[PDB]
Design an enzyme around this catalytic site. Structure first.
Site, PDB file in Angstrom:
ATOM      1  N   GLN B 146      -5.073 -11.004  -2.862  1.00  0.00           N
ATOM      2  CA  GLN B 146      -6.426 -11.264  -2.308  1.00  0.00           C
ATOM      3  C   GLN B 146      -7.476 -10.324  -2.910  1.00  0.00           C
ATOM      4  N   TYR B 332      24.736  22.641  21.446  1.00  0.00           N
ATOM      5  CA  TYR B 332      25.809  21.631  21.570  1.00  0.00           C
ATOM      6  C   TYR B 332      26.218  21.049  20.206  1.00  0.00           C
ATOM      7  N   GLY B 444      29.219  16.517  33.491  1.00  0.00           N
ATOM      8  CA  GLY B 444      29.480  15.116  33.104  1.00  0.00           C
ATOM      9  C   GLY B 444      30.141  14.917  31.789  1.00  0.00           C
ATOM     10  N   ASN B 480      26.483  11.003  26.683  1.00  0.00           N
ATOM     11  CA  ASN B 480      26.779  12.472  26.741  1.00  0.00           C
ATOM     12  C   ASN B 480      26.946  13.159  25.385  1.00  0.00           C
TER      13      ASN B 480
HETATM   14  C1  F43 Z   1      -0.575 -14.857   0.880  1.00  0.00           C
HETATM   15  C2  F43 Z   1      -1.439 -15.143   2.137  1.00  0.00           C
HETATM   16  C3  F43 Z   1      -0.584 -16.046   3.070  1.00  0.00           C
HETATM   17  C4  F43 Z   1       0.013 -15.060   4.009  1.00  0.00           C
HETATM   18  O1  F43 Z   1       1.064 -15.224   4.668  1.00  0.00           O
HETATM   19  N1  F43 Z   1      -0.655 -13.913   4.027  1.00  0.00           N
HETATM   20  C5  F43 Z   1      -1.766 -13.871   3.034  1.00  0.00           C
HETATM   21  C6  F43 Z   1      -1.738 -12.565   2.223  1.00  0.00           C
HETATM   22  C7  F43 Z   1      -1.685 -11.358   3.179  1.00  0.00           C
HETATM   23  C8  F43 Z   1      -1.597  -9.936   2.519  1.00  0.00           C
HETATM   24  C9  F43 Z   1      -2.511  -9.840   1.243  1.00  0.00           C
HETATM   25  C10 F43 Z   1      -2.282  -8.532   0.363  1.00  0.00           C
HETATM   26  C11 F43 Z   1      -2.147  -8.814  -1.102  1.00  0.00           C
HETATM   27  O2  F43 Z   1      -3.151  -9.386  -1.596  1.00  0.00           O
HETATM   28  O3  F43 Z   1      -1.119  -8.490  -1.711  1.00  0.00           O
HETATM   29  C12 F43 Z   1      -2.022  -9.043   3.694  1.00  0.00           C
HETATM   30  C13 F43 Z   1      -2.885  -7.812   3.361  1.00  0.00           C
HETATM   31  C14 F43 Z   1      -0.839  -8.637   4.620  1.00  0.00           C
HETATM   32  C15 F43 Z   1       0.160  -7.749   3.920  1.00  0.00           C
HETATM   33  N2  F43 Z   1       1.266  -8.242   3.393  1.00  0.00           N
HETATM   34  O4  F43 Z   1      -0.129  -6.522   3.814  1.00  0.00           O
HETATM   35  C16 F43 Z   1      -2.954  -9.957   4.482  1.00  0.00           C
HETATM   36  N3  F43 Z   1      -2.870 -11.226   4.126  1.00  0.00           N
HETATM   37 NI1  F43 Z   1      -4.398 -12.662   4.449  1.00  0.00          NI
HETATM   38  N4  F43 Z   1      -5.740 -11.188   4.984  1.00  0.00           N
HETATM   39  C17 F43 Z   1      -6.986 -11.272   5.332  1.00  0.00           C
HETATM   40  C18 F43 Z   1      -7.788 -12.500   5.508  1.00  0.00           C
HETATM   41  C19 F43 Z   1      -7.259 -13.697   4.984  1.00  0.00           C
HETATM   42  C20 F43 Z   1      -8.217 -14.901   4.736  1.00  0.00           C
HETATM   43  C21 F43 Z   1      -9.131 -14.527   3.542  1.00  0.00           C
HETATM   44  C22 F43 Z   1     -10.190 -15.647   3.337  1.00  0.00           C
HETATM   45  C23 F43 Z   1     -11.198 -15.262   2.253  1.00  0.00           C
HETATM   46  O5  F43 Z   1     -12.147 -16.103   2.060  1.00  0.00           O
HETATM   47  O6  F43 Z   1     -11.164 -14.173   1.602  1.00  0.00           O
HETATM   48  C24 F43 Z   1      -7.205 -16.015   4.375  1.00  0.00           C
HETATM   49  C25 F43 Z   1      -7.001 -16.960   5.609  1.00  0.00           C
HETATM   50  C26 F43 Z   1      -8.253 -17.780   5.816  1.00  0.00           C
HETATM   51  O7  F43 Z   1      -8.620 -18.496   4.862  1.00  0.00           O
HETATM   52  O8  F43 Z   1      -8.846 -17.765   6.929  1.00  0.00           O
HETATM   53  C27 F43 Z   1      -5.905 -15.257   4.092  1.00  0.00           C
HETATM   54  C28 F43 Z   1      -4.872 -15.817   3.399  1.00  0.00           C
HETATM   55  C29 F43 Z   1      -3.609 -15.233   2.989  1.00  0.00           C
HETATM   56  N5  F43 Z   1      -3.139 -14.142   3.565  1.00  0.00           N
HETATM   57  C30 F43 Z   1      -2.787 -15.814   1.897  1.00  0.00           C
HETATM   58  C31 F43 Z   1      -3.417 -15.414   0.500  1.00  0.00           C
HETATM   59  C32 F43 Z   1      -4.861 -15.967   0.337  1.00  0.00           C
HETATM   60  C33 F43 Z   1      -5.226 -15.987  -1.151  1.00  0.00           C
HETATM   61  O9  F43 Z   1      -4.444 -16.584  -1.936  1.00  0.00           O
HETATM   62  O10 F43 Z   1      -6.263 -15.407  -1.521  1.00  0.00           O
HETATM   63  N6  F43 Z   1      -5.964 -13.935   4.589  1.00  0.00           N
HETATM   64  C34 F43 Z   1      -9.057 -12.380   6.141  1.00  0.00           C
HETATM   65  O11 F43 Z   1      -9.763 -13.369   6.547  1.00  0.00           O
HETATM   66  C35 F43 Z   1      -9.767 -11.059   6.401  1.00  0.00           C
HETATM   67  C36 F43 Z   1      -8.765  -9.891   6.643  1.00  0.00           C
HETATM   68  C37 F43 Z   1      -7.698  -9.904   5.493  1.00  0.00           C
HETATM   69  C38 F43 Z   1      -6.431  -9.011   5.687  1.00  0.00           C
HETATM   70  C39 F43 Z   1      -6.626  -7.569   5.230  1.00  0.00           C
HETATM   71  C40 F43 Z   1      -7.470  -6.743   6.136  1.00  0.00           C
HETATM   72  O12 F43 Z   1      -7.559  -6.989   7.363  1.00  0.00           O
HETATM   73  O13 F43 Z   1      -8.133  -5.736   5.649  1.00  0.00           O
HETATM   74  C41 F43 Z   1      -5.363  -9.749   4.939  1.00  0.00           C
HETATM   75  C42 F43 Z   1      -3.962  -9.545   5.527  1.00  0.00           C
HETATM   76  C1  F43 Z   2      19.897  23.365  35.299  1.00  0.00           C
HETATM   77  C2  F43 Z   2      21.204  22.985  34.573  1.00  0.00           C
HETATM   78  C3  F43 Z   2      21.664  21.666  35.264  1.00  0.00           C
HETATM   79  C4  F43 Z   2      21.117  20.555  34.370  1.00  0.00           C
HETATM   80  O1  F43 Z   2      20.873  19.394  34.742  1.00  0.00           O
HETATM   81  N1  F43 Z   2      20.892  21.063  33.143  1.00  0.00           N
HETATM   82  C5  F43 Z   2      21.032  22.553  33.071  1.00  0.00           C
HETATM   83  C6  F43 Z   2      19.783  23.201  32.391  1.00  0.00           C
HETATM   84  C7  F43 Z   2      19.439  22.424  31.060  1.00  0.00           C
HETATM   85  C8  F43 Z   2      18.286  22.998  30.241  1.00  0.00           C
HETATM   86  C9  F43 Z   2      18.174  24.515  30.251  1.00  0.00           C
HETATM   87  C10 F43 Z   2      16.779  25.068  29.688  1.00  0.00           C
HETATM   88  C11 F43 Z   2      16.191  26.149  30.594  1.00  0.00           C
HETATM   89  O2  F43 Z   2      16.927  27.174  30.759  1.00  0.00           O
HETATM   90  O3  F43 Z   2      15.042  26.018  30.973  1.00  0.00           O
HETATM   91  C12 F43 Z   2      18.526  22.340  28.852  1.00  0.00           C
HETATM   92  C13 F43 Z   2      18.052  23.162  27.638  1.00  0.00           C
HETATM   93  C14 F43 Z   2      17.954  20.903  28.789  1.00  0.00           C
HETATM   94  C15 F43 Z   2      16.425  20.846  28.748  1.00  0.00           C
HETATM   95  N2  F43 Z   2      15.766  20.562  29.875  1.00  0.00           N
HETATM   96  O4  F43 Z   2      15.772  21.165  27.715  1.00  0.00           O
HETATM   97  C16 F43 Z   2      20.006  22.299  28.863  1.00  0.00           C
HETATM   98  N3  F43 Z   2      20.609  22.460  30.066  1.00  0.00           N
HETATM   99 NI1  F43 Z   2      22.601  23.125  30.288  1.00  0.00          NI
HETATM  100  N4  F43 Z   2      22.771  23.589  28.289  1.00  0.00           N
HETATM  101  C17 F43 Z   2      23.791  24.118  27.629  1.00  0.00           C
HETATM  102  C18 F43 Z   2      25.073  24.458  28.166  1.00  0.00           C
HETATM  103  C19 F43 Z   2      25.315  24.495  29.525  1.00  0.00           C
HETATM  104  C20 F43 Z   2      26.535  25.233  30.159  1.00  0.00           C
HETATM  105  C21 F43 Z   2      26.255  26.733  29.970  1.00  0.00           C
HETATM  106  C22 F43 Z   2      27.540  27.527  30.397  1.00  0.00           C
HETATM  107  C23 F43 Z   2      27.330  29.013  30.116  1.00  0.00           C
HETATM  108  O5  F43 Z   2      28.338  29.775  30.454  1.00  0.00           O
HETATM  109  O6  F43 Z   2      26.357  29.514  29.502  1.00  0.00           O
HETATM  110  C24 F43 Z   2      26.433  24.793  31.608  1.00  0.00           C
HETATM  111  C25 F43 Z   2      27.449  23.713  31.946  1.00  0.00           C
HETATM  112  C26 F43 Z   2      28.896  24.283  31.934  1.00  0.00           C
HETATM  113  O7  F43 Z   2      29.045  25.252  32.745  1.00  0.00           O
HETATM  114  O8  F43 Z   2      29.737  23.807  31.178  1.00  0.00           O
HETATM  115  C27 F43 Z   2      24.980  24.260  31.760  1.00  0.00           C
HETATM  116  C28 F43 Z   2      24.364  24.134  32.982  1.00  0.00           C
HETATM  117  C29 F43 Z   2      22.986  23.660  33.214  1.00  0.00           C
HETATM  118  N5  F43 Z   2      22.251  22.973  32.346  1.00  0.00           N
HETATM  119  C30 F43 Z   2      22.321  24.016  34.531  1.00  0.00           C
HETATM  120  C31 F43 Z   2      21.835  25.479  34.536  1.00  0.00           C
HETATM  121  C32 F43 Z   2      22.968  26.530  34.333  1.00  0.00           C
HETATM  122  C33 F43 Z   2      22.533  27.890  34.828  1.00  0.00           C
HETATM  123  O9  F43 Z   2      22.020  27.955  35.959  1.00  0.00           O
HETATM  124  O10 F43 Z   2      22.597  28.825  34.074  1.00  0.00           O
HETATM  125  N6  F43 Z   2      24.403  23.984  30.476  1.00  0.00           N
HETATM  126  C34 F43 Z   2      26.122  24.742  27.190  1.00  0.00           C
HETATM  127  O11 F43 Z   2      27.372  24.814  27.488  1.00  0.00           O
HETATM  128  C35 F43 Z   2      25.854  25.007  25.749  1.00  0.00           C
HETATM  129  C36 F43 Z   2      24.592  24.286  25.206  1.00  0.00           C
HETATM  130  C37 F43 Z   2      23.436  24.439  26.185  1.00  0.00           C
HETATM  131  C38 F43 Z   2      22.185  23.549  25.943  1.00  0.00           C
HETATM  132  C39 F43 Z   2      21.174  24.112  24.947  1.00  0.00           C
HETATM  133  C40 F43 Z   2      21.619  23.902  23.501  1.00  0.00           C
HETATM  134  O12 F43 Z   2      22.424  23.015  23.210  1.00  0.00           O
HETATM  135  O13 F43 Z   2      21.113  24.750  22.672  1.00  0.00           O
HETATM  136  C41 F43 Z   2      21.640  23.447  27.370  1.00  0.00           C
HETATM  137  C42 F43 Z   2      20.839  22.104  27.614  1.00  0.00           C
END
Ligand code: F43
Ligand code: F43
Ligand SMILES: C[C@@H](OP(=O)(O)O)[C@H](NC(=O)CCCCCCS)C(=O)O
Ligand SMILES: O=S(=O)(O)CCS
Ligand SMILES: O=S(=O)(O)CCS
Ligand SMILES: [Mg+2]
Ligand SMILES: [Mg+2]
Ligand SMILES: [Mg+2]
Ligand SMILES: [Mg+2]
Ligand SMILES: [Mg+2]
Ligand SMILES: [Mg+2]
Ligand SMILES: [Mg+2]
Ligand SMILES: [Mg+2]
Ligand SMILES: [Zn+2]
Lengths: 246, 548, 442, 548, 55
Positions: B146, B332, B444, B480
């Site tokens: 176009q 983790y 979990g 998990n």
């Molecule tokens: C190949 C198609 C069929 C199809 O599925 N999509 C096309 C082409 C596609 C391509 C054209 C890019 C390129 O040139 O490589 C893109 C930009 C979409 C894309 N793939 O990125 C586009 N149309 Ni079309 N297309 C447009 C339009 C139009 C108007 C252009 C009429 C004119 O008199 O110039 C007519 C439909 C109509 O007659 O109403 C039209 C047709 C067509 N549209 C005919 C090609 C027409 C030609 O041979 O020149 N588009 C528009 O009416 C305005 C917005 C304009 C879009 C780009 C933008 O929004 O900036 C573009 C939107």
């Molecule tokens: C509030 C929860 C319950 C829950 O739904 N998620 C928590 C907290 C959440 C927070 C902690 C961020 C913060 O401190 O603000 C985040 C980072 C998730 C998030 N919201 O971005 C996380 N756990 Ni948890 N959590 C982790 C872990 C764990 C281990 C930590 C055991 C230890 O002895 O330190 C235990 C589970 C278990 O006992 O097996 C655990 C519990 C818990 N996990 C207890 C808080 C424990 C505490 O009071 O200290 N996570 C891990 O075992 C290792 C990876 C670690 C994660 C961060 C990372 O992957 O870098 C984090 C992943």
């Protein structure tokens, strides 16, 4: 119930944390007020907030399952659901993340337990959470150097220990006192300063950590040498594989 | 020799890597870090210029109570802080995805049939060269028919062009060689003969649209843009009316009947058009990566360059931004491409399989899965137990799960020559790891892991698929971190051990064998290092049209 | 019969209703009450006449916070509801004596509409229900008030929303339990894209009925997806019977035994003892102080373990009266039972895996939400082939008020209308009665 | 006085604009143009650097056998060749789209209710301000909870932030003012009272994610990225466990139950996620443009600034790239925002209606459509017959159809105060123009035009909708240039004549009343001219992380 | 030529049971005819129904 296969001390410890008939060893004494302070959800002397009204006030429709299933006490009251979260060092802490969630759903009612590598959490109704939390803090679920109560910023399970044998804590909630050999909790689990620190007792020594741990490691008991526990994992893999196919 | 990760551990920390104890809290927080200090300064300047507070190191918790570590990019000698590997801060990682997003493969076979049979005109290598000169004027956005067209500035769109390839050597050599991806120059002899047999007498275009357009718009713009300018150049070069009934056959052929997208579109909860990361199957990701034609003597290097490609794109950009965002998922993914860690574990497994079976000689069955995946999972996990600095480096359990299982699944597939038993070995690794340490990944992490064994060999509707055909939209994988880039490595592994020229699509493999791309797909980890160093030059920038 | 198995069927109070019913009498392919529920779901629409009137009077149409100043129209639609509904019904029906139903509720503020089953037998899918309903109400409102050609397009915007500029009926004042076909995660998924809060609202929070409606919808989708074809059919039918239909009173009896003081672990112990007592599993091998169990019938083991999983949900989330922990029960019931036995968990690990992701996506920043907003078509919870979502419905039925996105928040229009329909509200009754009716035809 | 287009015509051509003849073929083709000469030179430099031919003026037909014209940007004194208005070459146009794509509106109303009910904690102006400082650190990609996080470079993400607005003056007063879009400052008093009444006591965030992330990824990233960092900042500022059951309600509210996307997702043949141009309804595009709050005593200026915003976005970027590409559609759009031509025709129509009826006073019926749209259609067509230089300027029939029908449709809606009768006037203008000149637009231009009269007042499923709710996905409008931006102007026209503060969504109107945006939405045509002159500075560039 | 029974549609929301039930019945009949192994059967599935559900 059997709970877990294997012939190591680690295996037996995993079964004992699950078995509600096994009496968890109590290692330290903590007051009710100090469990409330460590949890950080309410102040001592604050009434339990509610998320809905008491069940008695609700008069709900006839449902055989509701009638068969007794609500926990905090559910009858309408208490908030709140949490306690722990991190366990890979250097031989006694409890570890899956051991906790598995044990919690054998031991405790009405429990939402979640496991991650660096944190493990339970959520339940507030007054029941305080009862469970005392047991999680006082017993061998907890060691004050190799486990931490942490509601955020949990990093440390996989870190090297410091020179006192304490796990890393970005927020330093548990401080080892060289003068007593005991750890104090100085902040609540989300990191706010406590008015007065809570004594958490002495860290377990190395021999007792090895007796009580539930992690397998080459420098303790390795999983690859608990050949009966590996056999059952491999059996589960193969049976799931064949089931999914035909 | 030392394990491959030792040098990196000695660079990160003052202690020997085996030492169990260290010092925390004395490093000055963020002030230990050159990168965090650049960020604090930049946050003060951004907030002052715009009048709204932004980055502030004192909001929330104080980073750097422990060492903020450098990371070695694996296969390189480049060490950077992990912020330099965030995809926002790394121009090479952004360009890698722009180069995939803006490419489409478009046949000329139907087109040439339309010219011969419907317009009654001849096609020869000379007419193909004249069309190629015309479409390399038109494709960046310039006019051929176009009057009063207004056009793109050629220097803003200098990265857009069209090349061709064919398996017929004598036809390839007759087209002007400025337009030809030469299979025999770019591939070693045996892989060239495999690829040319696949293509035969077919002739294919590789079309790259401008990076500035792909950034302004989306992936689903690529095959449309390509087709508009193919259509204009077929009108101009074969002397059609500019818009007649046969023009519609070239449009349908270029936009549907002979187009190969890099990604297929996604379902509505995660709606996206074509050429987004979630649509890219794992076998295509392995074929986009070009390590296979350069490092074919070393199947470990070829597999782990595919893991780096997929861990960055699928976890950092796709799951960490398209599907979430924020600070995201740098480390983790870095766990799979730093410190030579996955490399150490996967060379161990390759050597194990060479000794016991020979590559590709093991029986393709469950006994091989159980043997190799268990052996390699216990090797990897022993390394974190024997080296406390290695465990503090890969501090999150998800990171370790993905690294150990990737070595176990790649090594199973090196033994069987088949990606499906490789994938069964990945799942067995997660189950053994979870029982060894009483932890695996984040809350979990193992959704797909627990569904995993049963769905490896299922044949049901939305369950059954060969691993090469799965991708980020396979249902169990859609959410998990720490899986998808490792699965692309397991899909590469048997084919690298077999010496196969491609994993799933020979046309995708040839389409990225082109030094006119902006990112160098033959050395993905090298390029990640160059971007981290702020040494990579991306396309798409607006400097030419903005103030000096 | 293709399968020899029989089951005993009970009501929601634990009483026997019918013994020795062939398994295929509960198949969605054979049971006529499952057919009636599914066709009912396809053809039922809730119409919010008050909402339509208020959208028009304020010009608030086309989605959240949208308004067109100067387009307001004040029409007495709820005051003329009877005439409007009758005029709609005459366009919706095919004949005078078909199964079209148009019923006013709430003094004319809402209408229950059931489009005639016959429009569906000549349709590809189910969108005729909202689209026939919406046009018949738009035309009946225009005709009631003689709304002009210049203003009538506001009635259309108030009924159906921003469609077709939006793909969904964004801002619509009609509602269905199904969602549009373009939102399916895969072909065959439409009976899975039904929000858990809409099943709990329809069933009035009766736990056993909510579990039965959810299972009938999930397992009927398994047939439409081809998952329940050939080798897998018996697995799917036994899942439907044991997890969703309380077959053999297994679910009910586990809950009765563990309801007062039990935990997920105590339910697991009872289910393993019951499987052993019935001969479904047996000890294959002794390790050191540990019995490895085997089974010669994996489909039946899977079904018993599925009934235990439902009972464990009811015990755990029933005790807390808080639905969030269903994600935990779905994970650890399955994880514990595999290390308890050496046998594979429900759906061969797929429930456990769905539960891992569900837990994460109901306790994290990344997505999901509360239990009530999931469904079998949600990306987080589609992975198990019918054995997970019914437990989420039982848990939300048991929630006493802990959720912000509760069924009262998300599903009030669906509750008012769809709980009127007896086979939606009380499906266990109807599917049992039907299975007894066809028992000799299998 | 001179018609408003006379100065531009006198700039384009040596002849007076009434003159009927000229001379062609003697301008030297492309050599007459500064910009084509820049392109020829750059093509040769590009092709040598890369070793593949590129822009060449001798391929295809020879541009410039007639005058290659300058264009005046309407309302400015800036004259540029049309290539400087191509979106690839105009960084102001690219930025306008990036600022819409990277914005989401996210309520705090559900979130504050989860805080008070589930958590039992208080929300106040103080806790909101603390939350906003936190989210303005987190939102650009920085950490607030975990150790060893790696973060985005603040200066790459300096355009990302979170503000709030509310109808409650006494909160908007109590929240730090750096974070507040102040309705009383930004809007004249009558519009401010309308907008505050619509919002009431609701509090809404306006979240802008980084342009560099939007460009790397897609529009569907924005609401996910926003919700991750709102979720982290709610956990940090309100002291949640960092990941508990309540955290899921903040995620569902921020991602689904209180979000306003700028665009909704698209059907599969044109698959795209949210925040893509095809999803943005015409009523929202008029409310994004901010001319209504600056130029409210001139309804023609407000309506024509909305036409310029929409013709560029919907024809140049959306239809001319996302849905096609190549040279594209610059001048199909420039006809609606250059040479003051649409302005002359629309000011004639406004005067005709103010004198006959009074604005907003005419009956809302077909008698008014027939009167005003026929009178304004004959005025605009008469100008092309009286001024040959005007007809040679808007040379394509489609350009003339869109300009004449926009003026007829806007004028009809200035008479009735209702956009639907303005739309019927647009279609009547097409039918009269087609009979007057025995042509209209391009081959496919009036598909929607011939369905048009019958679908203006239809009520059927995929036919019936008020014009303000229609958009580029309304079925009849989904394919063709020369309509969509003009429909946005008709949507604005009755609301500008009535003095309404917004057209369809008051939250969208307030969300762009913000001088912290990169693009200035109060003066869209001024910005297009600044970009054309290469004087606009966009966000998103990689210069800071690439070599000098 | 395969015509899936009408009764499967009167208990379905839509029409995808026709390809989905046909595909799985042929995939299982081919695996059963030749005793294709668990390791190879996923290739039968791919040859019948393609890249679904990744696509
Ligand atoms: C190949 C198609 C069929 C199809 O599925 N999509 C096309 C082409 C596609 C391509 C054209 C890019 C390129 O040139 O490589 C893109 C930009 C979409 C894309 N793939 O990125 C586009 N149309 Ni079309 N297309 C447009 C339009 C139009 C108007 C252009 C009429 C004119 O008199 O110039 C007519 C439909 C109509 O007659 O109403 C039209 C047709 C067509 N549209 C005919 C090609 C027409 C030609 O041979 O020149 N588009 C528009 O009416 C305005 C917005 C304009 C879009 C780009 C933008 O929004 O900036 C573009 C939107
Ligand atoms: C509030 C929860 C319950 C829950 O739904 N998620 C928590 C907290 C959440 C927070 C902690 C961020 C913060 O401190 O603000 C985040 C980072 C998730 C998030 N919201 O971005 C996380 N756990 Ni948890 N959590 C982790 C872990 C764990 C281990 C930590 C055991 C230890 O002895 O330190 C235990 C589970 C278990 O006992 O097996 C655990 C519990 C818990 N996990 C207890 C808080 C424990 C505490 O009071 O200290 N996570 C891990 O075992 C290792 C990876 C670690 C994660 C961060 C990372 O992957 O870098 C984090 C992943
Ligand atoms: C689950 C789903 O979110 P919704 O529940 O639909 O909000 C989905 N997100 C994701 O899968 C998040 C994946 C990335 C972050 C978690 C990685 S482990 C999505 O946004 O489409
Ligand atoms: O703690 S969670 O597992 O929910 C999140 C890990 S990033
Ligand atoms: O000529 S056509 O109408 O097909 C296209 C105009 S851009
Ligand atoms: Mg005591
Ligand atoms: Mg020759
Ligand atoms: Mg050995
Ligand atoms: Mg190079
Ligand atoms: Mg018992
Ligand atoms: Mg014995
Ligand atoms: Mg002259
Ligand atoms: Mg400016
Ligand atoms: Zn983009």
């Amino acid at each position: 119930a059997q709970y877990y296969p294997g012939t190591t001390k680690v295996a037996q410890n995993r079964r004992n944390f699950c078995n509600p008939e096994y009496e968890l060893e109590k290692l330290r004494e903590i007051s009710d007020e100090d469990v409330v302070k460590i949890l950080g959800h309410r102040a001592p002397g604050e009434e339990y907030p509610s998320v809905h009204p008491p069940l008695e006030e609700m008069d709900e429709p006839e449902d055989a399952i509701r009638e068969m299933v007794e609500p926990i006490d905090g559910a009858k009251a309408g208490d908030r659901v709140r949490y306690i979260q722990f991190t366990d060092s890979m250097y031989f802490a006694p409890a570890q993340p899956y051991v906790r969630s598995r044990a919690y759903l054998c031991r405790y009612r009405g429990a939402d337990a979640g496991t991650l590598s660096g944190r493990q959490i339970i959520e339940t109704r507030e007054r029941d959470l305080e009862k469970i939390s005392k047991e999680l803090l006082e017993t061998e679920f907890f060691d004050p150097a190799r486990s931490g109560v942490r509601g955020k910023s949990v990093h440390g399970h996989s870190l090297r220990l410091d020179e006192d044998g304490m796990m890393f804590d970005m927020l330093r909630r548990q401080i080892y006192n060289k003068d007593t050999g005991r750890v104090e909790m100085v902040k609540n689990q989300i990191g706010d300063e406590l008015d007065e620190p809570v004594d958490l007792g002495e860290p377990l020594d190395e021999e007792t950590l090895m007796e009580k741990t539930t992690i397998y490691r080459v420098d303790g008991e390795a999983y690859r040498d608990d050949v009966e526990a590996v056999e059952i994992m491999q059996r589960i893999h193969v049976l799931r594989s064949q089931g999914g196919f035909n | 020799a030392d394990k491959l990760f030792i040098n990196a551990l000695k660079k990160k920390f003052e202690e020997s890597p085996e030492e169990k104890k260290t010092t925390f809290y004395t490093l000055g927080g963020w002030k230990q870090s050159e990168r965090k200090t650049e960020f604090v300064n930049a946050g003060k300047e951004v907030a002052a210029k715009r009048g709204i507070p932004q980055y502030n190191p004192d909001i929330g918790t104080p980073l750097g109570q422990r060492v903020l570590m450098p990371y070695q990019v694996s296969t390189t000698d480049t060490y950077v802080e992990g912020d330099d590997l965030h995809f926002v801060n790394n121009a090479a990682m952004q360009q890698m995805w722009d180069d995939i997003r803006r490419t489409v493969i478009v046949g000329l076979n139907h087109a040439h049939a339309v010219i011969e049979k419907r317009l009654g005109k001849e096609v020869t290598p000379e007419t193909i060269t004249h069309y190629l000169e015309t479409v390399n004027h038109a494709m960046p956005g310039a006019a051929v028919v176009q009057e009063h067209m207004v056009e793109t500035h050629p220097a803003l769109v200098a990265d857009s062009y069209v090349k061709v390839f064919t398996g017929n050597d004598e036809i390839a050599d007759e087209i002007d060689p400025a337009f030809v991806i030469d299979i025999n120059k770019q591939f070693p002899e045996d892989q060239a003969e495999t690829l040319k047999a696949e293509v035969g007498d077919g002739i294919w275009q590789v079309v790259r649209i401008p990076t500035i357009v792909s950034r302004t718009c989306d992936g689903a713009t690529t095959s449309r843009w390509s087709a508009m300018q193919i259509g204009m150049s077929m009108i101009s070069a074969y002397k059609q009316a500019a818009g007649e009934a046969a023009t519609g056959d070239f449009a349908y052929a270029a936009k549907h009947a002979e187009v190969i997208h890099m990604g297929t579109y996604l379902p509505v909860r995660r709606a996206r058009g074509e050429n987004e990361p979630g649509g890219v199957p794992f076998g295509y990701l392995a074929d986009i990566c070009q390590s296979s034609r350069v490092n074919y003597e070393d199947p470990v290097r070829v597999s782990l360059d595919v893991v780096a490609t997929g861990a960055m794109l699928y976890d950092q950009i796709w799951l960490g931004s398209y599907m979430s965002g924020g600070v995201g998922f740098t480390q983790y993914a870095t766990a799979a491409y730093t410190d030579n860690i996955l490399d150490d574990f996967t060379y161990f497994g390759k050597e194990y399989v060479e000794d016991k079976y020979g590559l590709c000689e093991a029986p393709n069955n469950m006994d091989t899965v159980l043997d190799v995946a268990t052996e390699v999972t216990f090797y990897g996990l022993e390394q974190y137990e024997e080296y406390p600095a290695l465990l503090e480096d890969q501090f999150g359990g998800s990171q370790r799960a993905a690294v150990v299982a990737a070595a176990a699944g790649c090594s199973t597939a090196f033994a069987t020559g088949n990606a499906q038993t490789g994938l069964s070995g990945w799942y067995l690794s997660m189950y053994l790891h979870k029982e060894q340490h009483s932890r695996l990944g984040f809350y979990g992490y193992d959704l797909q892991d627990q569904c995993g064994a049963s769905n490896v060999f299922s044949i049901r509707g939305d369950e059954g698929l060969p691993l090469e055909l799965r991708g980020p939209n396979y249902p169990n994988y859609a959410m998990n971190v720490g899986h998808q880039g490792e699965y692309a490595g397991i899909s590469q592994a048997p084919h690298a051990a077999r010496g196969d020229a491609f994993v799933f699509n020979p046309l995708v493999k040839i389409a990225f064998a082109d030094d006119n791309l902006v990112f160098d797909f033959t050395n993905v980890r090298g390029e990640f290092a160059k971007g981290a160093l702020r040494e990579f030059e991306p396309a798409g920038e607006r400097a030419l049209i903005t103030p000096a | 019969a293709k399968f020899e198995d029989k089951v005993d069927l009970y009501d929601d109070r634990g009483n026997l209703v019918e013994e020795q019913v062939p398994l295929e009498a509960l198949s969605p392919l054979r049971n006529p009450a499952i057919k009636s529920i599914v066709q009912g779901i396809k053809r039922t629409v809730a119409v919010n006449l008050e909402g339509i009137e208020n959208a028009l009077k304020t010009a608030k149409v086309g989605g959240p916070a949208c308004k067109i100043m100067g387009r307001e129209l004040d029409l007495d639609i709820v005051g003329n509801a009877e005439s409007i509904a009758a005029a709609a019904k005459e366009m919706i029906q095919v004949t005078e004596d078909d199964d079209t139903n148009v019923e006013l509720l709430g003094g004319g503020k809402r209408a229950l509409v059931q489009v005639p089953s016959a429009r569906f037998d000549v349709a590809a899918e189910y969108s005729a229900a909202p689209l026939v309903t919406a046009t018949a109400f738009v035309q009946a409102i225009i005709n009631e008030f003689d709304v002009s050609m210049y203003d009538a397009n506001m009635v259309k915007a108030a009924v159906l929303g921003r469609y077709p500029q939006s793909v969904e009926y964004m801002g619509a004042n009609i509602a269905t339990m199904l969602d549009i076909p373009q939102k399916l995660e895969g072909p065959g998924y439409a009976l899975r894209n039904i929000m858990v809060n809409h099943v709990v609202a329809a069933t009035l929070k009766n736990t056993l009925q909510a579990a039965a409606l959810s299972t009938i919808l999930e397992q009927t989708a398994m047939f439409e997806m081809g998952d329940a074809v050939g080798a897998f059919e018996r697995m799917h039918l036994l899942g439907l019977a044991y997890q969703g239909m309380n077959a053999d009173n297994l679910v009910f009896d586990l809950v009765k035994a563990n309801g007062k003081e039990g935990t997920v672990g105590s339910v697991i112990a009872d289910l393993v003892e019951r499987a052993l007592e019935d001969g479904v599993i047996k000890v294959e091998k002794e390790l050191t102080d540990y019995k490895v169990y085997g089974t010669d019938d994996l489909a039946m083991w899977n079904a018993y373990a599925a009934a235990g999983l439902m009972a464990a949900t009811m015990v755990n989330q029933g005790a807390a009266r808080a639905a969030q922990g269903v994600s935990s029960t779905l994970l650890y019931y399955n994880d514990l039972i595999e290390f308890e036995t050496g046998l594979p968990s429900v759906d061969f690990g797929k429930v456990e895996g769905t539960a891992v992701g569900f837990s994460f996506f109901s306790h994290s920043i990344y997505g999901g939400g509360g239990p009530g907003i999931f469904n079998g078509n949600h990306i987080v919870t589609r992975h198990s082939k019918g054995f997970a979502i019914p437990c989420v419905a039982a848990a939300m039925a048991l929630d006493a008020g802990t959720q912000m996105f509760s069924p009262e928040a998300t599903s009030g229009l669906i509750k008012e209308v769809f709980s009127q329909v007896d086979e939606f509200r009380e499906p266990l009754k109807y599917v049992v009665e039907a299975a007894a009716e066809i028992k000799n035809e299998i």
